[PDB]
Design a protein around this ligand. Structure first.
Ligand SMILES: [Cu+2]
Ligand SMILES: [Cu+2]
Ligand SMILES: [Zn+2]
Ligand SMILES: [Zn+2]
Ligand SMILES: [Zn+2]
Ligand SMILES: [Zn+2]
Lengths: 153, 153
Protein backbone atom coordinates (compact mmCIF):
# COMPACT_ATOMS: atom_id res chain seq x y z
CA UNK A 1 0.00 0.00 0.00
CA UNK A 2 0.95 3.65 -0.45
CA UNK A 3 -0.32 6.51 1.70
CA UNK A 4 -0.25 10.25 1.23
CA UNK A 5 -1.51 13.34 3.06
CA UNK A 6 -2.17 17.03 2.37
CA UNK A 7 -2.67 19.97 4.72
CA UNK A 8 -4.88 22.62 3.08
CA UNK A 9 -4.38 26.23 4.06
CA UNK A 10 -5.02 29.63 2.49
CA UNK A 11 -5.67 33.32 3.21
CA UNK A 12 -9.19 32.96 4.59
CA UNK A 13 -10.59 30.52 7.13
CA UNK A 14 -10.50 27.37 5.00
CA UNK A 15 -8.30 24.64 6.35
CA UNK A 16 -8.26 20.90 6.35
CA UNK A 17 -6.34 17.63 6.28
CA UNK A 18 -6.91 15.16 3.48
CA UNK A 19 -5.63 11.57 3.52
CA UNK A 20 -4.98 9.33 0.53
CA UNK A 21 -4.58 5.53 0.62
CA UNK A 22 -3.99 3.11 -2.25
CA UNK A 23 -3.75 -0.62 -1.44
CA UNK A 24 -2.01 -1.62 -4.70
CA UNK A 25 -0.64 -0.33 -8.02
CA UNK A 26 -3.38 0.99 -10.22
CA UNK A 27 -6.01 0.36 -7.53
CA UNK A 28 -8.67 2.72 -6.20
CA UNK A 29 -7.42 5.61 -4.10
CA UNK A 30 -9.41 6.44 -0.97
CA UNK A 31 -9.46 10.17 -0.26
CA UNK A 32 -10.89 11.34 3.05
CA UNK A 33 -10.67 13.92 5.80
CA UNK A 34 -12.29 17.13 6.94
CA UNK A 35 -12.19 20.70 5.64
CA UNK A 36 -13.62 23.51 7.72
CA UNK A 37 -14.27 27.17 7.08
CA UNK A 38 -16.20 26.63 3.86
CA UNK A 39 -19.48 28.14 2.71
CA UNK A 40 -22.37 25.70 2.98
CA UNK A 41 -22.74 23.74 -0.28
CA UNK A 42 -20.54 22.35 -3.06
CA UNK A 43 -16.87 23.21 -3.64
CA UNK A 44 -14.56 22.26 -6.51
CA UNK A 45 -11.77 19.90 -5.52
CA UNK A 46 -8.84 19.36 -7.80
CA UNK A 47 -5.36 18.07 -8.15
CA UNK A 48 -3.34 20.83 -9.81
CA UNK A 49 -0.18 20.05 -11.74
CA UNK A 50 2.58 21.69 -9.71
CA UNK A 51 3.44 21.35 -6.04
CA UNK A 52 4.51 24.98 -6.10
CA UNK A 53 3.02 27.23 -3.46
CA UNK A 54 5.61 30.00 -3.80
CA UNK A 55 2.81 32.41 -4.89
CA UNK A 56 0.28 30.66 -2.73
CA UNK A 57 -2.29 28.57 -4.58
CA UNK A 58 -1.78 30.56 -7.80
CA UNK A 59 1.52 28.90 -8.59
CA UNK A 60 0.00 25.40 -8.65
CA UNK A 61 -0.67 25.55 -12.38
CA UNK A 62 -3.61 24.04 -14.19
CA UNK A 63 -5.46 20.80 -13.44
CA UNK A 64 -3.20 17.76 -13.55
CA UNK A 65 -3.72 16.59 -17.12
CA UNK A 66 -0.85 14.60 -18.64
CA UNK A 67 -2.75 13.84 -21.90
CA UNK A 68 -4.07 17.36 -22.46
CA UNK A 69 -7.70 16.34 -22.32
CA UNK A 70 -10.77 18.45 -21.57
CA UNK A 71 -12.12 19.04 -18.08
CA UNK A 72 -14.80 16.59 -16.96
CA UNK A 73 -16.57 15.07 -14.06
CA UNK A 74 -14.93 12.29 -12.08
CA UNK A 75 -17.12 9.62 -13.67
CA UNK A 76 -16.37 10.75 -17.25
CA UNK A 77 -13.98 9.08 -19.70
CA UNK A 78 -12.85 12.53 -20.79
CA UNK A 79 -11.50 14.13 -17.64
CA UNK A 80 -8.30 15.51 -16.31
CA UNK A 81 -6.56 13.17 -13.85
CA UNK A 82 -7.03 15.91 -11.26
CA UNK A 83 -10.82 16.18 -11.63
CA UNK A 84 -12.15 14.98 -8.28
CA UNK A 85 -15.73 14.96 -6.97
CA UNK A 86 -16.99 18.29 -5.51
CA UNK A 87 -16.90 18.31 -1.72
CA UNK A 88 -19.93 19.32 0.33
CA UNK A 89 -19.78 21.65 3.33
CA UNK A 90 -22.61 21.50 5.84
CA UNK A 91 -24.33 24.38 7.61
CA UNK A 92 -21.38 24.69 10.05
CA UNK A 93 -18.89 25.06 7.15
CA UNK A 94 -17.47 21.55 7.44
CA UNK A 95 -16.93 19.12 4.57
CA UNK A 96 -16.47 15.50 5.64
CA UNK A 97 -14.68 14.28 2.55
CA UNK A 98 -15.08 10.68 1.44
CA UNK A 99 -14.11 9.82 -2.14
CA UNK A 100 -12.88 6.76 -4.01
CA UNK A 101 -11.19 7.51 -7.33
CA UNK A 102 -9.39 5.08 -9.64
CA UNK A 103 -8.08 7.64 -12.12
CA UNK A 104 -5.74 9.32 -9.68
CA UNK A 105 -2.87 7.20 -8.34
CA UNK A 106 -0.08 7.25 -5.76
CA UNK A 107 2.36 5.74 -8.28
CA UNK A 108 2.88 5.64 -12.03
CA UNK A 109 1.78 8.00 -14.76
CA UNK A 110 -1.18 9.35 -12.79
CA UNK A 111 0.84 9.84 -9.57
CA UNK A 112 -0.34 12.89 -7.63
CA UNK A 113 2.40 12.87 -4.97
CA UNK A 114 4.25 16.17 -5.09
CA UNK A 115 1.29 17.94 -6.78
CA UNK A 116 -1.16 20.40 -5.19
CA UNK A 117 -4.65 19.71 -3.88
CA UNK A 118 -6.96 22.72 -4.12
CA UNK A 119 -10.42 23.42 -2.72
CA UNK A 120 -12.40 26.09 -4.54
CA UNK A 121 -14.84 28.95 -3.98
CA UNK A 122 -17.71 27.50 -6.00
CA UNK A 123 -18.94 24.14 -7.32
CA UNK A 124 -17.17 22.60 -10.25
CA UNK A 125 -19.68 22.44 -13.16
CA UNK A 126 -18.24 19.10 -14.33
CA UNK A 127 -17.29 20.54 -17.71
CA UNK A 128 -21.00 20.90 -18.66
CA UNK A 129 -21.37 24.70 -18.18
CA UNK A 130 -21.47 25.35 -21.96
CA UNK A 131 -18.52 27.73 -22.19
CA UNK A 132 -14.84 27.41 -22.88
CA UNK A 133 -13.76 27.84 -19.27
CA UNK A 134 -16.11 25.03 -18.23
CA UNK A 135 -14.08 22.69 -20.47
CA UNK A 136 -10.82 23.84 -18.95
CA UNK A 137 -11.45 24.49 -15.25
CA UNK A 138 -15.12 23.69 -14.40
CA UNK A 139 -15.73 27.33 -13.40
CA UNK A 140 -15.07 26.64 -9.70
CA UNK A 141 -13.93 30.18 -8.91
CA UNK A 142 -11.07 31.08 -6.65
CA UNK A 143 -8.57 28.76 -4.99
CA UNK A 144 -9.46 29.06 -1.34
CA UNK A 145 -6.92 26.69 0.18
CA UNK A 146 -4.26 24.27 -1.01
CA UNK A 147 -1.33 22.14 -0.03
CA UNK A 148 1.27 19.89 -1.55
CA UNK A 149 0.48 16.16 -1.50
CA UNK A 150 3.14 14.35 0.53
CA UNK A 151 4.17 10.73 1.20
CA UNK A 152 2.74 9.53 4.53
CA UNK A 153 3.74 6.72 6.82
CA UNK B 1 15.29 18.08 -16.74
CA UNK B 2 13.08 17.64 -13.64
CA UNK B 3 12.42 20.55 -11.28
CA UNK B 4 11.02 20.76 -7.77
CA UNK B 5 10.43 23.45 -5.17
CA UNK B 6 9.82 23.73 -1.44
CA UNK B 7 8.36 26.54 0.64
CA UNK B 8 9.78 26.41 4.16
CA UNK B 9 7.55 27.62 6.98
CA UNK B 10 7.50 27.10 10.71
CA UNK B 11 5.83 29.24 13.32
CA UNK B 12 6.78 32.71 12.06
CA UNK B 13 10.49 33.56 12.32
CA UNK B 14 12.04 31.24 9.71
CA UNK B 15 10.77 31.25 6.11
CA UNK B 16 12.37 30.27 2.83
CA UNK B 17 12.08 29.03 -0.74
CA UNK B 18 14.30 26.27 -2.05
CA UNK B 19 14.55 25.18 -5.69
CA UNK B 20 15.71 21.84 -7.07
CA UNK B 21 16.87 21.05 -10.59
CA UNK B 22 18.11 17.79 -12.05
CA UNK B 23 19.16 18.12 -15.69
CA UNK B 24 19.44 14.35 -16.30
CA UNK B 25 18.28 11.11 -14.71
CA UNK B 26 20.84 9.92 -12.12
CA UNK B 27 22.58 13.30 -12.40
CA UNK B 28 23.45 15.86 -9.78
CA UNK B 29 20.66 17.93 -8.26
CA UNK B 30 21.21 21.66 -7.85
CA UNK B 31 19.60 23.00 -4.65
CA UNK B 32 19.36 26.76 -4.28
CA UNK B 33 17.34 29.56 -2.79
CA UNK B 34 17.10 31.73 0.34
CA UNK B 35 16.10 31.15 3.95
CA UNK B 36 15.64 34.10 6.34
CA UNK B 37 15.00 34.42 10.07
CA UNK B 38 17.98 32.30 11.17
CA UNK B 39 20.77 32.92 13.67
CA UNK B 40 24.12 33.65 12.02
CA UNK B 41 26.15 30.53 11.26
CA UNK B 42 25.53 26.92 10.37
CA UNK B 43 22.13 25.20 10.35
CA UNK B 44 21.27 21.57 9.67
CA UNK B 45 19.44 20.93 6.43
CA UNK B 46 17.75 17.56 5.83
CA UNK B 47 15.35 15.70 3.66
CA UNK B 48 13.05 13.88 6.09
CA UNK B 49 11.08 10.82 5.06
CA UNK B 50 7.45 11.93 5.11
CA UNK B 51 5.69 14.81 3.38
CA UNK B 52 3.40 15.00 6.41
CA UNK B 53 2.87 18.41 7.93
CA UNK B 54 -0.18 17.54 9.98
CA UNK B 55 1.75 18.07 13.20
CA UNK B 56 3.99 20.79 11.78
CA UNK B 57 7.57 19.67 11.19
CA UNK B 58 7.29 16.98 13.87
CA UNK B 59 5.35 14.63 11.58
CA UNK B 60 8.05 14.58 8.88
CA UNK B 61 9.63 11.46 10.42
CA UNK B 62 13.30 10.58 10.37
CA UNK B 63 15.93 11.38 7.80
CA UNK B 64 15.21 9.88 4.37
CA UNK B 65 17.19 6.67 4.52
CA UNK B 66 15.96 3.84 2.32
CA UNK B 67 18.87 1.47 3.01
CA UNK B 68 18.94 2.11 6.84
CA UNK B 69 22.42 3.62 6.83
CA UNK B 70 24.06 5.75 9.50
CA UNK B 71 23.92 9.54 9.48
CA UNK B 72 26.83 11.30 7.84
CA UNK B 73 28.11 14.40 6.12
CA UNK B 74 27.09 14.95 2.51
CA UNK B 75 30.50 13.87 1.18
CA UNK B 76 30.52 10.60 3.23
CA UNK B 77 29.82 7.25 1.51
CA UNK B 78 27.92 6.31 4.54
CA UNK B 79 25.16 8.89 4.85
CA UNK B 80 21.44 9.09 4.70
CA UNK B 81 19.99 10.13 1.34
CA UNK B 82 18.61 13.16 3.20
CA UNK B 83 21.91 14.35 4.64
CA UNK B 84 22.49 17.67 2.86
CA UNK B 85 25.21 20.18 3.53
CA UNK B 86 24.59 22.56 6.44
CA UNK B 87 23.39 25.98 5.30
CA UNK B 88 25.12 29.17 6.38
CA UNK B 89 23.15 32.23 7.57
CA UNK B 90 24.81 35.65 7.37
CA UNK B 91 24.83 38.42 9.93
CA UNK B 92 21.30 39.42 8.91
CA UNK B 93 19.91 35.92 9.34
CA UNK B 94 19.83 35.03 5.65
CA UNK B 95 21.19 31.84 4.12
CA UNK B 96 21.79 31.95 0.42
CA UNK B 97 21.68 28.28 -0.29
CA UNK B 98 23.75 26.82 -3.15
CA UNK B 99 24.37 23.08 -3.09
CA UNK B 100 24.97 20.37 -5.66
CA UNK B 101 24.20 16.87 -4.40
CA UNK B 102 24.53 13.61 -6.29
CA UNK B 103 22.83 11.35 -3.76
CA UNK B 104 19.41 12.94 -3.68
CA UNK B 105 17.36 12.63 -6.85
CA UNK B 106 14.07 13.81 -8.37
CA UNK B 107 13.23 10.30 -9.61
CA UNK B 108 14.00 6.68 -8.74
CA UNK B 109 14.96 5.13 -5.46
CA UNK B 110 16.43 8.35 -4.07
CA UNK B 111 13.42 10.50 -5.17
CA UNK B 112 12.75 13.32 -2.66
CA UNK B 113 9.54 14.66 -4.33
CA UNK B 114 6.70 14.38 -1.77
CA UNK B 115 9.14 14.30 1.18
CA UNK B 116 9.93 17.14 3.62
CA UNK B 117 12.84 19.55 3.60
CA UNK B 118 13.73 20.78 7.10
CA UNK B 119 16.07 23.55 8.37
CA UNK B 120 17.35 23.19 11.91
CA UNK B 121 18.25 25.16 15.03
CA UNK B 122 21.90 24.14 15.14
CA UNK B 123 24.62 22.81 12.91
CA UNK B 124 24.54 19.18 11.89
CA UNK B 125 27.60 17.52 13.49
CA UNK B 126 28.10 15.30 10.40
CA UNK B 127 27.68 12.12 12.40
CA UNK B 128 31.01 12.84 14.17
CA UNK B 129 29.62 13.94 17.55
CA UNK B 130 30.54 10.66 19.28
CA UNK B 131 27.12 9.60 20.44
CA UNK B 132 24.32 7.53 19.21
CA UNK B 133 22.10 10.48 18.26
CA UNK B 134 24.98 11.85 16.19
CA UNK B 135 24.83 8.65 14.08
CA UNK B 136 21.07 9.06 13.71
CA UNK B 137 20.29 12.74 13.36
CA UNK B 138 23.50 14.82 13.51
CA UNK B 139 22.28 16.57 16.70
CA UNK B 140 20.94 19.62 14.80
CA UNK B 141 18.35 20.58 17.38
CA UNK B 142 14.83 21.67 16.66
CA UNK B 143 13.06 21.77 13.33
CA UNK B 144 12.70 25.54 12.69
CA UNK B 145 10.88 25.34 9.36
CA UNK B 146 9.89 22.81 6.77
CA UNK B 147 7.86 22.12 3.67
CA UNK B 148 6.84 19.36 1.30
CA UNK B 149 8.97 19.07 -1.84
CA UNK B 150 6.73 19.61 -4.86
CA UNK B 151 7.01 19.12 -8.61
CA UNK B 152 7.76 22.51 -10.29
CA UNK B 153 7.35 23.75 -13.85
CU1 LIG C 1 -8.87 23.24 -8.85
CU1 LIG D 1 16.49 17.34 9.70
ZN1 LIG E 1 -5.63 -6.34 -7.51
ZN1 LIG F 1 -3.51 9.22 -18.30
ZN1 LIG G 1 -10.09 19.62 -14.73
ZN1 LIG H 1 20.85 11.85 8.47
Amino acid sequence: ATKAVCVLKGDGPVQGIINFEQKESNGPVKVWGSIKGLTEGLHGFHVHEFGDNTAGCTSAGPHFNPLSRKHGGPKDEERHVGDLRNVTADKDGVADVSIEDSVISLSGDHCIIGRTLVVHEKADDLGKGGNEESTKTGNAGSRLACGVIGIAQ
